[PDB]
């Protein structure tokens, strides 16, 4: 009796005898109506504030290692002439040895290959990618983490070897940093639309097949119903 009304069910259940028994069930009903109305509330609070989690993180992941056990495996894109190739060829040889079949011919061609399912992930410089994250017509998912970069460096101005004109520009650039004029030069530079400025996620739950945990809470009881059936052989010895 006491399970059917706490979990909102009209199981056919005989009430207990007498009017004196009728009180405690009427307390339990007031515990039930408060209970489920709490739990539906908290769950509805929980499932419209939780954030999507970043299924690939870092270059040390098994996905970015040798892609053995993956229905069709990961395809990494890169441009094969520049600095990133010379950095990636001195730390992970087999990574670029696998990546050699997936070259791209341009930045926008990398975006067109990313939109058509032809590429799973793309590897390039940080500043150009942080610009192109902000100037897509949609503002869907962009970069791993927030701004986590692997080999932090800078841009610069190349110059003739040991010329005297280095030490002046070395002052003058710092004077620009001293004046805040880079943020005055921000109006052309990297601003945009949707730089994760909502952190919203709306999802049709075709991915509601994550309910396998409560299916595991089902079939475990489907085990225990056999187990107790086996311990219902104990009156044969008693």
């Amino acid at each position: 009796l006491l399970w059917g009304l706490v979990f909102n069910n009209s199981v056919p259940v005989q009430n207990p005898k007498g009017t004196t028994s009728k009180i405690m069930v009427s307390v339990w009903a007031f515990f039930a109506v408060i209970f489920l109305a709490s739990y539906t509330a908290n769950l509805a609070a929980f499932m419209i504030q939780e954030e999507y989690v970043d299924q690939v993180s870092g270059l040390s992941d098994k996905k970015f290692q040798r892609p053995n056990d993956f229905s069709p495996p990961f395809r990494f894109g890169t441009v094969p002439n520049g600095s990133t190739e010379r950095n990636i060829r001195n730390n992970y040889a087999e990574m670029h040895a696998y990546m050699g079949k997936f070259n791209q011919r341009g930045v926008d061609d990398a975006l067109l290959s990313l939109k058509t399912g032809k590429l799973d992930a793309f590897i390039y410089d940080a500043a150009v990618l942080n610009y192109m994250a902000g100037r897509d017509e949609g503002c869907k998912l962009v970069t791993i983490g927030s701004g986590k970069v692997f080999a932090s460096t800078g841009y610069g101005i190349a110059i003739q070897k040991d010329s005297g004109w280095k030490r002046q520009v070395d002052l003058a650039i710092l004077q620009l940093f001293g004046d805040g004029e880079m943020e005055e030069l921000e109006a052309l530079w990297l601003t945009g639309i949707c730089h994760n400025e909502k952190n919203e996620v709306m999802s049709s739950q075709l991915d509601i097949d994550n309910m396998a945990g409560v299916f595991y809470m089902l079939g475990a009881a489907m085990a225990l119903s056999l187990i107790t059936f086996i311990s219902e052989h104990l009156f044969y010895w008693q």
Binding site: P12, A44, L206
Partner: protein, 135 residues
């Protein structure tokens, strides 16, 4: 001065007439209903037989159809978590129905003259004013 643009469509969730996730609003749960009726049948036979599905559907849909509880406790401990599962799926359906109607839509529009959609020009946006005017 101000900028004039065109409002969008955005829809309501009327087309989800009890089908928000009918891809995964599975009939697999109905097979679970049938096999748990078969399981209670097998638990009750070898310790009220053909009526087990008329029990179990009445557990799910909150409809009190005339029926008797299973006599063995081994079926009762399965029925406990079956009713708990029914409460779980109806509460999750309630929360995901509220999620469609509480969450708004993307495409935040342009804000003043300091927008890079408008400050830095392109082909994807067209701007115009009346000729020979104060603008």
């Amino acid at each position: 001065l101000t900028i004039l643009v065109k409002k969008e469509i955005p829809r309501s969730t009327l087309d989800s007439f009890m089908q928000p996730f009918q891809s995964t609003l599975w009939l697999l749960v109905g097979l679970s209903v049938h096999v748990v009726a078969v399981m209670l049948y097998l638990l009750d036979r070898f310790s009220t037989l053909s009526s087990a599905m008329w029990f179990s559907w009445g557990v799910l849909l909150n409809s009190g159809i005339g029926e008797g509880a299973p006599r063995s406790f081994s079926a009762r401990i399965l029925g406990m978590v079956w009713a708990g599962f029914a409460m779980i799926i109806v509460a999750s359906y309630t929360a995901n129905l509220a999620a469609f109607l509480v969450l708004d839509r993307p495409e935040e529009r342009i804000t003043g003259i300091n927008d890079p959609r408008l400050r830095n020009p392109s082909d994807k946006f067209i701007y115009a004013t009346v000729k020979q005017s104060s603008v």
